[PDB]
């Protein structure tokens, strides 16, 4: 019954509109939902704008007059030029006359800010269409109207604020480069008169609401105005002195001064420097007297959230970091500026103590800027010794566990602070370690944080000073473990003792006995049931293996064998209580050491001794599960097989090409097992349906295949002898994985088969011509059919499919030349099918294949296949690219769409296509492709964008084609075309911008 206002054949019920609106805003439930589908339908009515002058004049609901302006905004934006010239001045006068009426009624000017701000913006949308060519008196009349009322002058500051935003801050995406440059020029020519009004209102007072609205417009001007309006007047004196005392203006003034710290400044003029130092001096002075002193606990102020404190401190952090990162050199030479420089940094020290992660990351980026400057620039580091002294404690007490990026930044700052003063950093770290021992600052969180800071500064002190330091820490950390009582409290300390020693490999590589002791104790912790200690031992083990692996392969003095052999002899007893994932990490760590042995047959001997257990378990299951293959339904047998394989993947990951003999030891039975596991996966689906693919029995079976392929992918990606890969590995692999994939149901096809074929082609593709040709025969058509129905089903197969087609196009492109002509068409359909994906992991890959496919056709020269390609698929690739470029649903890939289209256009204006693109009858003979292209495109754009005049399509195509060599301009021409197709009446002269 509320759907009556949708009938435009009658008149509009204003009072019913106010009911429908309030039912949507103040209402709830199903009546609110229905009220919305009406208000939306009312708004989307293409003739609804004709009723906006009733609502704005007669309605009493401010939310109705808002939606009226929303309909006007749409009309002014998209169809303003399709209007008869009469309406354009009725709307302009109605909006101007309305805004004037609201500044007179202080009840409206005060209690209806939303409707006024919306009105001012709708006024700006008109200025974007009519000003100044059809409204030159706007700015002068705006200034005369500002002296006749406080409410008008204040609101005029709102119009200019929105105007400057729409012209300089948000015009790149929304208007053409011609229309954008037009309004930028128009505002610059009339800004001297605007600044006069602004500076007068700032100096003459007195209404705070008018002052703030004026300051808010100044913030927008500092984005683009010439520097003389800031430095050649007296306005910096007012921003830094007068407006920092009142909290109403303090927030915006600080944001303005934050911008002024980033203007265009000739750093040769000695007077602007005094201005840049003066406003910083005044600002820090008003903060010290009118807000809070430099010794105030800002961590506590922020934590109390009184009023606007958390934003002032936010903005004060931005101001100081912005200014000092660009102007602190002005303060470092003069001795009368030394205290101003230091007080400024002392405020930052206080802010750096605030518990606010995003605020901390801000100030940390400045500390990074400073300590890197004190590490390189001469004579500067002594100015900040007291600043750096406190900074060390600030960072040592907020060291995060190694966001992964916050730690690297904290370590980098902390490493710089150690180079500037080793003695001070030791005293801070040892005294904090002492305060952990007396129990004052003792906590799990606080001992870990201290342990991370100590571990982060390794390799910055001399090997002698570091030696003395690590021992002092190890001593105090052990004494802390005898102190505390309870496995929990002792495991916390004992774990930090291992993180520290894992961080000092330089220390470990000079002391074998201590290093040997640490590894053996790590082994003992691998039998420790306490949660987090086995993973602590396994992580620290491989962590130290990575940096000290030489000391495990060479024969250390006073030892009878290299320690790698001793780890192998007891590996079963060492890895007995660890989880299967922890065993794989242990085996991976050993592979890191075995790779150091460059004696070949000695490295092979270690590999066989390391792989001893998984090989004996391998030969056992190879025999007892080949006759009869019943065990593959037993879960325990499947789990052993997966762990045997995952152990091979672990070692192959760290040994790479040095893994080939162990891979050969199992290769022919592993592929046989890959077959036998495939037989039951298919036998189970034929017995239980497609639901079996979800059952753990098949999920475990499909795991064996997923890991078998992963072991082969790992070695080939890292192999050095590519010949053996081709003549030993590729042959049985394809005859084991391809037919199984092809003749399986789509729900039983492992997507890693495509990934494994991608790595095979990536390494040895250029050596396997018929291999790639055979890979396509088994995986192309059947996978394409799995994904050519929607952008959703089988997402993993979708990504690996286009990865594989991409590398085939890069490496063995001749494999597509040997495709049947009907199958090559599906190949083209698949590439364009990738353009339409919103999934960027497919969209970018498809755009790349098209770009490389075109180049692959250009290299063939003037041959029949290349000519038949342009005859068939050239204009398809052009139109498909234009579609995804203009449908506003693939905006993430605009750059590669522009690049691919530019390559297609350039191919014609350089005569790189031999045959004519057209049929012999449809155009006169002798017509160049350059002309038929500008006709095919003109016809195509007219049928897809009938609201464009024939003169827009001409000027666009003219500019676009003659710019196919300048990508930055070409891209800009597309952006102008995209803007013009959202509206009617676009200027065809806008394509002459370049």
């Amino acid at each position: 019954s509320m759907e009556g206002i949708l009938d435009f054949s009658n008149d509009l019920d204003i009072a019913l509109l106010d009911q429908v609106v309030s039912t949507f805003y103040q209402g709830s439930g199903v009546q609110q939902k229905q009220a919305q589908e009406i208000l939306t339908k009312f708004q989307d009515n293409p003739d609804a704008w004709q009723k906006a002058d009733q609502i704005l004049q007669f309605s009493t609901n401010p939310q109705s007059k808002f939606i009226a302006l929303s309909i006007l905004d749409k009309l002014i934006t998209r169809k303003w030029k399709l209007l008869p010239n009469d309406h354009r001045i009725g709307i302009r006068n109605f909006v101007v006359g309305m805004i004037i009426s609201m500044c007179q009624d202080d009840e409206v000017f005060k209690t209806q800010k939303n409707l006024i701000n919306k009105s001012d913006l709708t006024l700006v949308q008109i200025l974007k269409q009519e000003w100044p060519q059809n409204w030159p008196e706007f700015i002068p009349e705006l200034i005369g109207s500002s002296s006749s009322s406080v409410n008008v002058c204040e609101n005029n500051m709102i119009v200019l604020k929105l105007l400057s935003e729409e012209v300089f801050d948000f015009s790149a995406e929304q208007m053409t480069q011609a229309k954008a440059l037009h309004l930028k020029n128009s505002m610059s020519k009339e800004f001297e008169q605007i600044f006069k009004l602004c500076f007068q209102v700032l100096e003459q007072g007195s209404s705070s609401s008018l002052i703030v609205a004026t300051l808010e417009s100044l913030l927008r001007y500092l984005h683009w105005i010439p520097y003389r309006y800031i430095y050649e007047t007296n306005i910096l004196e007012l921003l830094s002195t007068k407006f920092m005392t009142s909290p109403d203006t303090r927030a915006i003034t600080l944001k303005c001064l934050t911008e002024v710290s980033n203007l265009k400044i000739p750093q040769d003029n000695d007077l602007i420097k005094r201005q840049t130092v003066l406003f910083f001096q005044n600002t820090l002075q008003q903060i010290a007297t009118s807000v809070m002193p430099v010794t105030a606990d800002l961590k506590a102020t922020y934590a109390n959230a009184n009023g606007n404190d958390q934003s002032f401190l936010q903005d004060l952090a931005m101001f100081l970091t912005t200014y000092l990162a660009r102007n602190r050199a002005l303060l470092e030479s003069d001795e009368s500026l030394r205290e101003l420089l230091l007080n400024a940094h002392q405020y930052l020290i206080q802010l750096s103590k605030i518990e606010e992660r995003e605020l901390f990351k801000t100030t940390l980026d400045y500390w990074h800027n400073l300590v890197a400057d004190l590490f390189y620039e001469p004579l500067k580091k002594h100015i900040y010794e007291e600043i750096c002294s406190q900074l060390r404690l600030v960072i040592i007490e907020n060291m995060v566990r190694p966001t992964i990026q916050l730690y690297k930044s904290e370590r980098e700052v902390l490493v710089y602070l150690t180079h500037l003063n080793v003695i001070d950093t030791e005293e801070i770290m040892i005294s904090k370690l002492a305060r952990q021992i007396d129990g004052s600052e003792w906590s799990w969180h606080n001992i870990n944080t201290l342990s991370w800071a100590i571990g982060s500064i390794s390799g910055t002190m001399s090997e002698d000073t570091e030696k003395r330091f690590v021992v002092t820490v190890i001593k105090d950390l052990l004494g802390l473990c005898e102190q505390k009582r309870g496995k929990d409290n002792k495991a916390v300390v004992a774990s930090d003792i291992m993180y520290v020693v894992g961080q000092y490999p330089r220390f470990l590589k000079a002391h074998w006995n201590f290093l040997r002791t640490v590894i053996l104790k790590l082994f003992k912790f691998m039998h420790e049931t306490h949660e987090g200690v086995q993973d602590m031992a396994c992580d620290t083990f491989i962590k130290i293996v990575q940096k000290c692996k030489y000391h495990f392969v060479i024969q250390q003095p006073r030892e009878s064998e290299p320690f790698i052999q001793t780890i192998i002899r007891d590996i079963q007893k060492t890895t007995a209580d660890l989880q299967p994932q922890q065993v794989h990490t242990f085996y991976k760590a050993c592979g890191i050491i075995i790779s150091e042995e460059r004696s070949v047959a000695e490295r092979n001997r270690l590999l066989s001794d390391l792989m001893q257990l998984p090989n004996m378990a391998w030969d056992t299951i190879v025999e007892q599960s080949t006759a009869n293959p019943t065990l593959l339904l037993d879960s325990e047998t499947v789990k052993i097989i997966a762990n045997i394989i995952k152990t091979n993947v672990a070692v192959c990951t760290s040994m790479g090409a040095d893994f080939y003999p162990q891979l050969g030891h199992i290769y022919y039975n592993m592929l046989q097992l890959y077959r036998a596991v495939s037989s039951m996966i298919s036998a189970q689906v034929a017995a239980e349906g497609l639901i079996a693919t979800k059952t753990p029995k098949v999920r475990g079976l499909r795991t064996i295949k997923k890991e078998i392929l992963k072991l082969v992918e790992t070695y080939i990606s890292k192999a050095r002898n590519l010949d053996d890969v081709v003549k030993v590995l590729v042959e049985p692999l394809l005859n084991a994985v391809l037919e199984d994939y092809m003749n399986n149901v789509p729900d039983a096809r492992d997507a890693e088969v495509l990934n494994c074929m991608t790595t095979v082609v990536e390494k040895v593709g250029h050596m396997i011509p018929q291999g790639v040709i055979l890979i396509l025969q088994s995986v192309f058509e059947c996978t394409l059919d799995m994904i050519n129905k929607d952008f959703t089903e089988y997402p993993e197969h979708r990504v690996e499919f286009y990865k594989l087609l991409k590398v085939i196009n890069e490496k063995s492109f001749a494999a597509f030349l040997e495709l049947p002509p009907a199958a090559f068409k599906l190949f083209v359909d698949a590439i364009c099918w990738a353009f339409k994906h919103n999934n960027r992991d497919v969209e970018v890959n498809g755009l790349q294949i098209a770009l490389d496919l075109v180049k692959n056709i250009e290299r063939m020269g003037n041959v029949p296949f290349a000519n038949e390609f342009h005859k068939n698929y050239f204009f398809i690739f052009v139109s498909e690219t234009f579609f995804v470029l203009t449908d506003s649903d693939h905006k993430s890939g605009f750059s590669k769409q522009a690049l691919l289209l530019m390559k297609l256009i350039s191919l014609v204006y350089d005569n790189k296509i031999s045959v004519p693109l057209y049929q012999e009858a449809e155009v006169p003979q002798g017509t160049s492709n350059q002309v038929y292209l500008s006709q095919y495109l003109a016809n195509m754009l007219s049928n897809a964008f009938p609201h464009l005049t024939s003169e827009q399509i001409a000027s666009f195509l003219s500019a676009l084609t003659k710019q196919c060599k300048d990508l930055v301009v070409f891209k800009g021409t597309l952006r102008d075309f995209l803007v013009q197709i959202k509206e009617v009446g676009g200027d065809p002269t806008d394509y002459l911008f370049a």
Partner: peptide, 15 residues
């Protein structure tokens, strides 16, 4: 360090 190696070798978190 031979003495430090024994402080950590003996270290018991079960006490």
């Amino acid at each position: 360090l031979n003495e430090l190696a024994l402080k950590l070798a003996g270290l018991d978190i079960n006490k």
